[PDB]
């Protein structure tokens, strides 16, 4: 009994050391991820500004701005971590995703999964729910290329191929250090937000159409960055 | 000349009759078996001990090699095979066919 207790007290000490090291490394990577989140703010602000200007000059008939006549499917991009030890992070994200799926069914929409991060793949495979496409291995250090690919696949599915009539993104918003909340945002179709009150080359219809996918890409990139910060 | 170390933890897990394969051993070994049983189950105890060790090791691994996963599958099927209800004896021929 004494030998067992001393062995356990050894294991526990080693685990304490490893977990303290992980806590401090996480404190560092939180700073890194938050710095990245701030670094992408200028591009997001400027693209949003020019998008508002084009929308003011645009016709606002782009497919990403008009609801489908009868929504059958609704894609859901669940952003989860790819490595454990992140507490209830993945659990909260997937609970919010399941709540979103229930809401979608209550609205008649059939959810279809796109999953980021290995852990969500395990969660959904255990529950026999098919993921159409999944991306893994960058939740800790997202680049803009991953966001571009995710947004491209999502927009191609939305335009279409069975396709989807709507698409949401579930991810852990990094409200503050102490608090990180799993939130679901409809990334398409985008609501036109008229509010109280330039030249375009080529004409604002084509420029707006070529810009909107870029807007979705930058918003997905911001979501991935904020999910990484929340994961840390 | 040997042990059949029956474990309460294994008993509750549904591994009945509860032989902890690692600790249990028979030093008479194959000499106390018919040749068919000896040939069919020559390394069964060591294979199951290695399976238990690997199951403890692979409890949370998410990148198990193909050989490791095959070993876990074989070990789990062997564990199910060695389960047996009380008062349900098996003739030696049936035992060799089962372990086969």
């Amino acid at each position: 009994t004494l030998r067992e207790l001393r062995g356990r007290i050894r294991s526990a000490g080693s685990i304490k050391k490893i977990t303290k090291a992980q806590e401090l490394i996480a404190t560092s990577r939180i700073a890194k991820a938050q710095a990245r989140v701030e670094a992408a703010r200028p591009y997001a602000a400027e693209i949003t500004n020019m998008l508002t200007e084009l929308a003011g000059a645009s016709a606002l008939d782009h497919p990403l701005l008009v609801e489908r006549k009868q929504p059958k499917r609704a894609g859901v991009l669940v952003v989860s971590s790819d490595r454990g030890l992140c507490g209830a992070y993945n659990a909260n994200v997937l609970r919010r995703a399941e709540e979103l799926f229930s809401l979608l069914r209550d609205e008649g929409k059939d959810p279809v999964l796109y999953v980021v991060g290995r852990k969500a793949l395990g969660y959904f495979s255990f529950r026999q729910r098919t993921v159409v496409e999944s991306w893994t291995g960058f939740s800790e250090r997202p680049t803009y290329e991953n966001a571009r690919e995710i947004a491209d696949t999502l927009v191609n599915a939305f335009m279409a191929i069975l396709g989807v009539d709507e698409l949401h993104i579930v991810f852990t918003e990094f409200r503050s250090m102490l608090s990180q909340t799993a939130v679901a945002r409809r990334a398409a179709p985008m609501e036109v937000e008229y509010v109280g009150e330039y030249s375009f080359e080529p004409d604002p219809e084509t420029l707006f159409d070529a810009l909107l996918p870029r807007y979705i890409a930058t918003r997905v990139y911001a979501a991935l960055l904020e999910a990484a910060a929340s994961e840390s | 000349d040997g042990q059949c170390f029956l474990e309460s933890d294994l008993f509750n897990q549904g591994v009945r009759p509860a032989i902890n394969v690692g600790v249990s051993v028979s030093r008479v070994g194959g000499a106390a078996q018919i040749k068919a049983m000896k040939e069919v189950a020559g390394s069964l105890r060591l294979d199951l001990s290695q399976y238990r060790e690997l199951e403890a090791f692979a409890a949370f691994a998410s990148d198990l090699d193909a050989a490791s996963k095959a070993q876990l599958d074989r070990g789990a099927r062997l564990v199910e095979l060695l389960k047996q209800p009380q008062y349900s004896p098996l003739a030696v021929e049936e035992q060799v066919v089962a372990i086969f």
């Binding site: 937000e193 008229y194 918003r219 | -």
Partner: peptide
């Protein structure tokens, strides 16, 4: 025995919400 096992396995029955928006900057549609 192997042939018997295979022919038996042939017949064995296994039991196995925020919303993204574009701000138009004009007051009316």
């Amino acid at each position: 025995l192997v042939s018997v096992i295979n022919e038996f396995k042939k017949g064995f029955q296994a039991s196995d919400l925020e919303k993204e928006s574009v701000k138009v900057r004009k007051p009316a549609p």
